[PDB]
Amino acid sequence: TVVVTTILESPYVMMKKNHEMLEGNERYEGYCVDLAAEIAKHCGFKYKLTIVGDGKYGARDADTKIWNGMVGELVYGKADIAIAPLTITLVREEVIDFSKPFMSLGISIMIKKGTPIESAEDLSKQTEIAYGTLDSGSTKEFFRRSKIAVFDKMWTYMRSAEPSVFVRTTAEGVARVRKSKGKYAYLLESTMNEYIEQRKPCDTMKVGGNLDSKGYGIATPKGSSLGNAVNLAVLKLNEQGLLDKLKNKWWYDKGEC
Amino acid sequence: TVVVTTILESPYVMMKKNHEMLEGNERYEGYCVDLAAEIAKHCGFKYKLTIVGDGKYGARDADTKIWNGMVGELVYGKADIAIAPLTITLVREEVIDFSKPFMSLGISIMIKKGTPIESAEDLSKQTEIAYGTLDSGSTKEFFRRSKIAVFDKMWTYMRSAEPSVFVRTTAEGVARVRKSKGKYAYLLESTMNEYIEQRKPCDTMKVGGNLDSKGYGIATPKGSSLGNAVNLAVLKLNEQGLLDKLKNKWWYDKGEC
Ligand SMILES: O=C1N=c2cc([N+](=O)[O-])c([N+](=O)[O-])cc2=NC1=O
Numbered sequence: 469t470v471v472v473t474t475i476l477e478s479p480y481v482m483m484k485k486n487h488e489m490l491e492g493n494e495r496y497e498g499y500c501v502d503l504a505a506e507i508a509k510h511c512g513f514k515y516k517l518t519i520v521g522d523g524k525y526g527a528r529d530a531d532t533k534i535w536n537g538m539v540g541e542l543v544y545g546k547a548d549i550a551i552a553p554l555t556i557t558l559v560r561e562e563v564i565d566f567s568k569p570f571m572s573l574g575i576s577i578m579i580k581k582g583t584p585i586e587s588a589e590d591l592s593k594q595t596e597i598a599y600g601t602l603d604s605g606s607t608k609e610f611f612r613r614s615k616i617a618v619f620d621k622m623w624t625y626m627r628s629a630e631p632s633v634f635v636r637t638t639a640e641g642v643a644r645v646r647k648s649k650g651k652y653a654y655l656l657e658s659t660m661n662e663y664i665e666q667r668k669p670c671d672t673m674k675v676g677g678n679l680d681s682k683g684y685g686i687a688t689p690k691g692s693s694l695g696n697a698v699n700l701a702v703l704k705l706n707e708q709g710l711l712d713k714l715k716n717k718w719w720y721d722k723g724e725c
Numbered sequence: 726t727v728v729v730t731t732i733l734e735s736p737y738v739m740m741k742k743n744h745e746m747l748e749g750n751e752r753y754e755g756y757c758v759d760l761a762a763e764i765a766k767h768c769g770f771k772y773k774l775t776i777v778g779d780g781k782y783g784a785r786d787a788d789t790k791i792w793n794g795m796v797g798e799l800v801y802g803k804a805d806i807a808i809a810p811l812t813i814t815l816v817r818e819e820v821i822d823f824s825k826p827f828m829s830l831g832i833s834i835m836i837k838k839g840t841p842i843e844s845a846e847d848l849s850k851q852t853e854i855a856y857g858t859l860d861s862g863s864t865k866e867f868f869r870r871s872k873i874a875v876f877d878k879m880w881t882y883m884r885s886a887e888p889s890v891f892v893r894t895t896a897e898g899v900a901r902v903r904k905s906k907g908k909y910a911y912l913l914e915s916t917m918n919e920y921i922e923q924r925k926p927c928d929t930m931k932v933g934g935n936l937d938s939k940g941y942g943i944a945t946p947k948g949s950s951l952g953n954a955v956n957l958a959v960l961k962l963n964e965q966g967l968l969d970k971l972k973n974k975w976w977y978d979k980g981e982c
């Protein structure tokens with residue numbers, strides 16, 4: 469039985485309301501739960517969904533050299549595959565294998581409806597409306613390293629803004645936008661942004677085009693005997709229109725706004 | 726010296742007008758020429774750019790079983806690597822390996838400026854403005870296989886439309902949009918659509934969102950000693966902003982509109 473590590477991130481993997489009455493894989497629902505069943509069908513395996521212990525995606529502590537999260541579970545042999553919204557990055561790709569992306573995304577801007585901001589350029593031209601990113605990760609790194617005039621200006625502002633515009637978690641960034649009365653905008657991944665936009669109380673909005681591009685992929689330990697088939701399954705599912713069907717299902721069909 | 730196969734497709738690879746006075750890789754210019762140099766540098770190999778003999782991407786004859794194009798050049802050992810706008814697809818990944826995508830794209834609609842069409846649903850609700858795809862390939866198959874009502878409606882129309890709405894080449898689909906006085910819309914790659922949008926006479930426009938998601942990838946034979954490095958180089962180039970810099974350079978900085 470293949471041990472699948474995943475993460476409780478909506479709408480990818482969520483506990484069903486009546487989860488206490490259920491056991492195993494049936495306790496969960498979501499985009500990745502559906503995707504897991506599809507991957508298993510196309511690769512011919514049985515699996516057990518397990519939520520990553522530390523609730524993380526996966527980063528390497530710079531001093532201790534240790535990997536946490538789902539990446540850590542793969543690197544250390546605790547799971548056979550990770551079917552979750554895990555970003556395909558260079559550092560991760562160096563220690564684990566990734567399938568081709570099953571979903572594309574990029575940095576975007578989330579505002580509280582009513583806020584007079586329509587782009588990154590709008591944000592950069594003022595300070596009245598504070599804006600920031602998660603305190604660590606791809607979005608923060610993008611701005612810190614950017615050579616582009618507009619993004620570099622946003623970085624100079626964010627890195628010295630007081631009080632701090634950085635947040636510890638994505639939920640905090642979304643909550644800060646919602647409870648800041650039009651005075652805060654949050655830079656986060658487009659997928660999460662468009663998802664929140666379809667959730668009650670329907671008070672947020674995604675503005676402007678994506679600032680960069682990246683993709684989520686299914687991961688397996690380096691040299692895994694599942695890698696090849698998993699990759700082919702992703703490509704097949706995309707061409708069959710299934711990946712798009714699942715995106716529409718969990719974001720819009722199940723939307724509230 | 727690595728033998729790289731590529732294709733003369735703008736703005737990816739263009740033969741400099743004064744190529745006779747030039748030698749080797751210096752005879753060409755374009756997005757893929759710049760990409761080849763970056764990949765070569767980040768993988769530590771010397772290479773020679775060659776233009777695919779039959780000028781094709783790579784398709785397997787339903788009867789002959791023979792692979793044409795760049796894919797054929799790889800599976801038959803005529804080239805070690807393909808650095809071109811080669812779409813990552815299931816049929817091709819069955820016989821060659823693809824790196825993570827260096828460019829994202831999807832089926833899009835090209836119209837003559839002024840055409841009262843903003844989406845696929847708009848096209849599907851009328852017949853006055855004819856629309857079609859290349860007479861063979863990915864975009865045609867997308868419509869033929871779709872279970873989505875709008876796309877199925879569009880297929881039923883294109884299949885029996887008279888005069889024929891299918892074109893022999895991409896250049897013909899583009900020329901047909903330009904010369905049909907707003908009475909023809911062309912379905913093609915978003916990358917090519919946005920490229921043509923930046924070329925004189927500046928009479929075309931990309932409208933609506935992409936109907937699907939695909940990516941271009943660097944291709945190498947199965948078991949290639951170049952596979953791992955190439956993959957890492959693509960991710961690094963994306964994270965350092967180089968791929969976005971490259972596209973902006975060839976599509977917009979050099980744009981004529
Ligand atoms: O791998 C990752 N995947 C992510 C996926 C999401 N997600 O939205 O699914 C988010 N996020 O919530 O912004 C952050 C992420 N950070 C990561 O490091």
Ligand SMILES: O=C1N=c2cc([N+](=O)[O-])c([N+](=O)[O-])cc2=NC1=O
Nearest residue numbers: 734782810811812895913914916917
């Ligand atoms: O792999 C391929 N790559 C393509 C790239 C392009 N391109 O973007 O130049 C086109 N197109 O433009 O139609 C068609 C393609 N067809 C293919 O089958």
